[PDB]
Design a protein around this ligand. Sequence first.
Ligand SMILES: CC(=O)N[C@@H]1[C@@H](O)[C@H](O[C@@H]2O[C@H](CO[C@]3(C(=O)O)C[C@H](O)[C@@H](NC(C)=O)[C@H]([C@H](O)[C@H](O)CO)O3)[C@H](O)[C@H](O)[C@H]2O)[C@@H](CO)O[C@H]1O
Ligand SMILES: CC(=O)N[C@@H]1[C@@H](O)[C@H](O[C@@H]2O[C@H](CO[C@]3(C(=O)O)C[C@H](O)[C@@H](NC(C)=O)[C@H]([C@H](O)[C@H](O)CO)O3)[C@H](O)[C@H](O)[C@H]2O)[C@@H](CO)O[C@H]1O
Ligand SMILES: CC(=O)N[C@@H]1[C@@H](O)[C@H](O[C@@H]2O[C@H](CO[C@]3(C(=O)O)C[C@H](O)[C@@H](NC(C)=O)[C@H]([C@H](O)[C@H](O)CO)O3)[C@H](O)[C@H](O)[C@H]2O)[C@@H](CO)O[C@H]1O
Ligand SMILES: *[C@@H]1O[C@H](CO)[C@@H](O[C@@H]2O[C@H](CO)[C@@H](O)[C@H](O)[C@H]2NC(C)=O)[C@H](O)[C@H]1NC(C)=O
Ligand SMILES: *[C@@H]1O[C@H](CO)[C@@H](O[C@@H]2O[C@H](CO)[C@@H](O)[C@H](O)[C@H]2NC(C)=O)[C@H](O)[C@H]1NC(C)=O
Ligand SMILES: *[C@@H]1O[C@H](CO)[C@@H](O[C@@H]2O[C@H](CO)[C@@H](O)[C@H](O)[C@H]2NC(C)=O)[C@H](O)[C@H]1NC(C)=O
Ligand code: NAG
Ligand code: NAG
Ligand code: NAG
Ligand code: NAG
Ligand code: NAG
Ligand code: NAG
Ligand code: NI
Ligand code: NI
Ligand code: NI
Lengths: 319, 321, 319, 176, 173, 175
Amino acid sequence: PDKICLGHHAVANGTIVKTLTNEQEEVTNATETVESTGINRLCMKGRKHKDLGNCHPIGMLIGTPACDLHLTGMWDTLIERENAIAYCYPGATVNVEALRQKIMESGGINKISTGFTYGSSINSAGTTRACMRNGGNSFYAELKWLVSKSKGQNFPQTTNTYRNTDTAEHLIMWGIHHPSSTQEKNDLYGTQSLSISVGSSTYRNNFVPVVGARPQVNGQSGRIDFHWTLVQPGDNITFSHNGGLIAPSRVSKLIGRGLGIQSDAPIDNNCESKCFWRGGSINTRLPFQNLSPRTVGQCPKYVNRRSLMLATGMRNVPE
Amino acid sequence: ADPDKICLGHHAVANGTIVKTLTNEQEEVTNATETVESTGINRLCMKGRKHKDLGNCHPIGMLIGTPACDLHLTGMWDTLIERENAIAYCYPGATVNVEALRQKIMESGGINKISTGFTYGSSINSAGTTRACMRNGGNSFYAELKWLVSKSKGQNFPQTTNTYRNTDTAEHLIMWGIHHPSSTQEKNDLYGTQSLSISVGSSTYRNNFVPVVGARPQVNGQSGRIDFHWTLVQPGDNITFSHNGGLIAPSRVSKLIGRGLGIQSDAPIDNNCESKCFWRGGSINTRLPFQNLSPRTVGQCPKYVNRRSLMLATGMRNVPE
Amino acid sequence: PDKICLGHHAVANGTIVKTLTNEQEEVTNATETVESTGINRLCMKGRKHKDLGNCHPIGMLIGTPACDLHLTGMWDTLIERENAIAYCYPGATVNVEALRQKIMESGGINKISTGFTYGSSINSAGTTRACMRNGGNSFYAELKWLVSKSKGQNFPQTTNTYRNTDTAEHLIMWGIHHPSSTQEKNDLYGTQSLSISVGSSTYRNNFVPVVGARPQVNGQSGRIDFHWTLVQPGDNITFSHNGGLIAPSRVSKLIGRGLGIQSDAPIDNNCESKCFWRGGSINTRLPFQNLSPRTVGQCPKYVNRRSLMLATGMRNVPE
Amino acid sequence: GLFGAIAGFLENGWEGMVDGWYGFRHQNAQGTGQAADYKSTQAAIDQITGKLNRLVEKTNTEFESIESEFSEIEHQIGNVINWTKDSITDIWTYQAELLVAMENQHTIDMADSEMLNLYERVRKQLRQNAEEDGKGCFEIYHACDDSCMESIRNNTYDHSQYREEALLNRLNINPV
Amino acid sequence: GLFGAIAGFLENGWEGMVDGWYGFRHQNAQGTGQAADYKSTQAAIDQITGKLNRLVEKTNTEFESIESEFSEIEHQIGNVINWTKDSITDIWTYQAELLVAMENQHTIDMADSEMLNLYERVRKQLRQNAEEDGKGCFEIYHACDDSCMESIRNNTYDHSQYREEALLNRLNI
Amino acid sequence: GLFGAIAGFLENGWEGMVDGWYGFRHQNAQGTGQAADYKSTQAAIDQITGKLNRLVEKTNTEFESIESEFSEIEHQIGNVINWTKDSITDIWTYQAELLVAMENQHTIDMADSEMLNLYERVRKQLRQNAEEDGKGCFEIYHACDDSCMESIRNNTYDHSQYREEALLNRLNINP
Ligand SMILES: CC(=O)N[C@@H]1[C@@H](O)[C@H](O[C@@H]2O[C@H](CO[C@]3(C(=O)O)C[C@H](O)[C@@H](NC(C)=O)[C@H]([C@H](O)[C@H](O)CO)O3)[C@H](O)[C@H](O)[C@H]2O)[C@@H](CO)O[C@H]1O
Ligand SMILES: CC(=O)N[C@@H]1[C@@H](O)[C@H](O[C@@H]2O[C@H](CO[C@]3(C(=O)O)C[C@H](O)[C@@H](NC(C)=O)[C@H]([C@H](O)[C@H](O)CO)O3)[C@H](O)[C@H](O)[C@H]2O)[C@@H](CO)O[C@H]1O
Ligand SMILES: CC(=O)N[C@@H]1[C@@H](O)[C@H](O[C@@H]2O[C@H](CO[C@]3(C(=O)O)C[C@H](O)[C@@H](NC(C)=O)[C@H]([C@H](O)[C@H](O)CO)O3)[C@H](O)[C@H](O)[C@H]2O)[C@@H](CO)O[C@H]1O
Ligand SMILES: *[C@@H]1O[C@H](CO)[C@@H](O[C@@H]2O[C@H](CO)[C@@H](O)[C@H](O)[C@H]2NC(C)=O)[C@H](O)[C@H]1NC(C)=O
Ligand SMILES: *[C@@H]1O[C@H](CO)[C@@H](O[C@@H]2O[C@H](CO)[C@@H](O)[C@H](O)[C@H]2NC(C)=O)[C@H](O)[C@H]1NC(C)=O
Ligand SMILES: *[C@@H]1O[C@H](CO)[C@@H](O[C@@H]2O[C@H](CO)[C@@H](O)[C@H](O)[C@H]2NC(C)=O)[C@H](O)[C@H]1NC(C)=O
Ligand SMILES: *[C@@H]1O[C@H](CO)[C@@H](O)[C@H](O)[C@H]1NC(C)=O
Ligand SMILES: *[C@@H]1O[C@H](CO)[C@@H](O)[C@H](O)[C@H]1NC(C)=O
Ligand SMILES: *[C@@H]1O[C@H](CO)[C@@H](O)[C@H](O)[C@H]1NC(C)=O
Ligand SMILES: *[C@@H]1O[C@H](CO)[C@@H](O)[C@H](O)[C@H]1NC(C)=O
Ligand SMILES: *[C@@H]1O[C@H](CO)[C@@H](O)[C@H](O)[C@H]1NC(C)=O
Ligand SMILES: *[C@H]1O[C@H](CO)[C@@H](O)[C@H](O)[C@H]1NC(C)=O
Ligand code: NI
Ligand code: NI
Ligand code: NI
């Protein structure tokens, strides 16, 4: 007799997906849930960004020549590049990574003069070939290399106090010079025993310059180790020293919030993005990605899978 | 006649509630119930807990014996409550690995104190006091420490050795201080002109400290500082202090006993509600598996989620007439 | 009327499992998903392993007698035992746990001579009863205890530089001796003020021997504190010292990757495994385990449950 | 829905049925009436109840604070802690979203299935004495008084009692 | 499958049906024909679409870096970070595997159910005028021309119109 | 249950059916008998098996220790590690609870569906020659010998062979 038959559609080539019971289930259609493709550029549209270039974030606070255009500023996004320079004169900073993270988490930097002054037997204009500027020997912009005005003379016992009169905490950095020979130490600060004491109401510490033979870095066997702390509003911090202090001429103030990115990818001011990594940006609607476990911003979650297909159709049952 | 009939059906309600499913964000069902707790109790629910409210005493002050902590030098508790702006230091200073130490204390079920038995020769004055630590309207000092200075002003503090021997079957926590004077004159008055050195040594620990003169702002009228240090002395071990001025020596050591729950909150205590979950704002008593009050909680808590509400259906699809 | 009836199987005693709606659902069969049983042995088949025995990993670098058979080697698996010895002469190491983890993450160690040599007024063969070897006073194999050749004489101002001429970073360790009395320090190094400075192009530090009364450990009131850093390829590291330095005669080189295990379980070279813990090995196909939250290798995930039964059959409906 | 009844071939629910989740309406010579079905209602409710009790099962894991409310946290470790906590929170937020979405899907479909199970049970009781109208009713081809209706709800309806009358009516073979 | 239709009592799908997911083929005196069913197709598609929109809902959680790409990380903290990240990654990998497996199971079975719902709808329309052949067809016991077939697809088929003719044919009386 | 058969309109299971998960019992002039259905049994079993194989798939992520078994861990970092590990453990414990609950629900209901799929298959084979009794049986309105019963189980039963006999018997007016 007459007849009406019910049925469903199918396709010649379906796609494979996984279910609870079957690793190899064929369906009519499916779509990817794991993003494999990123953008090999830094998508900065809509962001007031600062590209530090060859300037390392820590160099912003102490004022390395490479950071001359980055001593102050405002930004919602801060970009660090590989092999950026923090030190012209060789040295190291205590809790360097904590400090770098503070800066890369900020929305800008301001600088405030310490107002430090020095008596006539101090030369506060110490320079070095390690920090060139305009084809001449120079120094960290935000610091002063104090040495005896007369070569060999004992550096005078000296006291300098920074007073934070702001309503927000300030970040103060200073250096301690560690000479490469006793002759050098004597030339710069005299033969007396050297000591630098630092004290606020919250911070207390002491430093001693130390002579030692060392490899040259940028032509220098000497070293300047850097230290930092936070000065609270209304607090004073006092430097008590008789040679070896690399004193601050300005302190820093980290303002607001910003997103910190480490990448060498070129900036594109026409795409926008919320997710970044070493290789660039990630713009995707997909909830997962397999590009990198080291991302910043608002990102899809990293998973160790090339592909996870989500079925968008019924079982495929071809003819 | 033509047919009678019986019809099958299900119930419905005038106003159903919206819930989410796998396929629909806006699915209407007959009934639903919340899975995320929004409401906490703005009090510390301490019923069934032998608790200690430290008040204005900071946990670290218990070990060194700040006046504010005089009623908290020893004790037993299953729950320890720290308040904002609690005092650890009367004489200004700082402690090394302060946060680790605070966490040890806030993880303990009580403190006991054991005398070091330290004694000093006649050229040492072990009764140093200060206006920074008042007690009974008089100059005093940390209860568990002694400020050692030369008996004769300006004299060199004698080379001195003091050894604490842990004869217990459990580890003890020993604290000491190092005084850092505000001027060379002051240092000379207290300890003499010799170069000063404090060495500390057990079979597990070795360290050395040097008092350092430096100009500093006054805190509680003091430009001087006392920095604190600590370590653990194992059962049967000896720890030896070798010093010639600047040591703030322990008269007693501490012993952290058992386990307890540490809470940081200014919420008022309520001894009539009980709870297993606490945060800055108070307590959380809920049967619900999730909460959106705070990601910083302590105890046995529902898991924090960034959602105002997640409704669980307790009925069928609502299909009104 | 004839009849055909449809039905399903059942069993006399079914097993209980949990579902979304029922904690007490009876089914015909079920199987465990949480492993309760481990192997109380270290399953080392297919692994080139090193059992350190009584030698602590840090003792490998400095050369404690207990580690004499473990000064170099290659391994894909390294086994540390409880109460292993790192120090014969008492002392401590700075950032000891970081260093231990580096070693327990390595696939072998090589040793390279520093080539350090000393003038005639230095005795570089200092030994101690604390480090016995062949029934005689000895010292850490990879270090040299430098003292004045003439008792009481001032130890000469001395400079030693290690140059890494390899293409990979080397790990250099040294010690600082802290005497138990002023008499002892004077005997060994003289009455001068003592100072040890260490400097590469990446590292700078300085150390001062310190006299102090202390309990005896292995008959010694003295102490030797250990320090370490990494020397990069092509870099030089310079020791500048006048008494108190325990100098390196060899540096270390961590090679490749390996799996580090802490366990006292006996080795079994006939079972193989990918998962280890304090108590031994875990060989299971099950995705979960309740043996321990502290495991190493490729392991099932730890869960706080004695049992979680997975149904392998229908609802049981007995007669 | 999955089982085709609720929000399916049943056009709507009955707001007037307040004493049960599922039930019957009838029409006969004596009039109309309504009654709830206890068993199907309890089956649905017990599954919802069992689900709710599973959700109260809580962790017995005691957690300590690792972030001081009243003092400074060193910046690097503070950042590590923050990263870890926010990762954990994203995991739990996602889990809760999924749990509820999945449970709700199951709850809805389970209820649909219990409606269908009742429908099917009645279809089989009635055997050859009734026909489905497609809207959830069974047109019964014999006089079925209030007791007869009750016997259908009570599951004691004997189809062979009415079979002859019903087949004649279904075929339109009733003698003049 | 769960509902017994797709890859079940329906032997296979129809590659030639490109204008819908579900539908009808018929045979009568005039010939054969095919047509898609809009409602069942939309029911399936809307559920898939709703599922996809739920999956785009993203985190608004801003994360900072805790691992420097361009400088050294201290070894112990670096190891803690690595352990933590790999644990998190294993959690998310597992979650994604489960999510997709579960959704796919549900998607497949939902589609099966919508096929069955259409089948059941037609069974009830046809009432006593047709019988099931077990392969998804209804043998209709009266002459059912193209309009009659359309009325079945359109859901306006009145069974009482053809009942008498159909019962006679079904019984041969 | 979801599909209404197992622990549903089927009053109980058959403990005596040991050679399959689903099957048939019959009654005719020759007597009674039992036989398992291979296809439905395999459908159920294959889905359980496939599920078990998915659950063996393990991580290939190598983890190092971050907690020394034999030496001290600094207290702050130790507490951070503990907090992190216990959070991870709570996540995995919850996941395992959910996984198993969900899989078990699905397994149970899948088995119910395969029973129903067999029932429906037989209903359609028998067409107009039999009626359902509501307990899972089909009363067959013609003489159906052991071969005829086998043809139903074997899926080769041709309803048109017996249709006329069966319709006459179904239209019987009984006492
Ligand atoms: C302009 C000038 O005074 N000297 C030129 C040299 O800079 C240059 O050779 C470099 O000299 C380096 C050491 O000398 C300095 C330096 O850093 O450049 C000279 C600085 O004035 C002195 N600064 C202060 C504040 O005293 C500085 C300091 O003593 C040490 O850095 C402390 O350790 O040392 C070094 O040897 C480099 O290798 C070299 O490039 C020569 C080239 O012939 O020309 C000079 O005119
Ligand atoms: C009432 C009394 O005993 N002394 C009065 C002096 O306090 C006051 O000079 C003031 O001295 C202040 C610090 O004084 C102490 C302290 O901390 O209170 C006095 C302690 O006896 C002394 N303790 C010990 C063990 O040495 C202590 C200690 O030297 C320092 O804290 C070390 O840093 O100092 C404070 O500095 C005021 O700024 C200062 O004016 C004099 C007035 O000249 O009158 C005394 O009656
Ligand atoms: C010179 C000598 O060996 N004298 C004998 C003493 O050893 C012994 O008194 C004991 O001295 C112990 C320390 O002895 C050594 C050691 O550790 O073995 C001897 C080492 O040669 C010496 N090494 C160097 C490089 O100087 C070493 C070193 O000075 C210290 O360890 C530095 O801290 O010391 C130990 O202190 C015992 O407690 C002490 O009784 C006496 C009695 O047996 O006989 C002496 O002939
Ligand atoms: C870790 O996260 C918390 C919460 O986001 C941060 O807390 C903020 O800290 C600053 C203090 O410097 C305050 O001004 C903010 O108001 C705090 N917000 C809250 C909600 O507490 C903390 O800064 C973070 N730590 C680091 C190192 O980034
Ligand atoms: C933490 O994990 C990272 C990533 O796996 C490690 O970095 C790699 O280390 C290998 C040496 O085994 C290098 O050759 C690679 O270049 C590194 N890869 C990346 C992406 O950085 C890192 O060493 C680990 N840290 C610790 C302390 O184990
Ligand atoms: C981190 O957790 C571990 C494991 O729970 C703690 O180690 C235990 O300490 C308790 C004391 O309360 C002892 O009873 C056990 O001997 C220890 N168990 C193990 C397995 O070692 C450890 O104390 C915790 N660390 C911190 C810093 O809180
Ligand atoms: C397959 O899936 C995606 C998402 O539903 C869709 O955009 C695409 O058009 C589909 N392909 C088909 C129906 O062929
Ligand atoms: C290390 O020393 C060698 C030999 O003196 C020298 O040629 C090389 O440049 C030095 N490397 C440094 C200073 O980094
Ligand atoms: C809805 O469900 C909750 C939890 O099951 C119950 O306590 C409440 O009584 C219900 N509300 C209504 C209006 O039925
Ligand atoms: C800082 O110095 C000013 C005077 O220059 C003084 O009035 C103020 O109180 C000082 N602050 C502190 C904290 O000592
Ligand atoms: C502590 O000193 C006593 C003094 O006799 C000694 O017996 C004991 O062994 C010492 N403890 C040590 C070395 O651990
Ligand atoms: C369940 O028990 C059966 C016995 O029927 C046993 O053979 C089997 O090993 C168990 N299940 C699985 C999946 O292995
Ligand atoms: Ni941050
Ligand atoms: Ni590692
Ligand atoms: Ni703890």
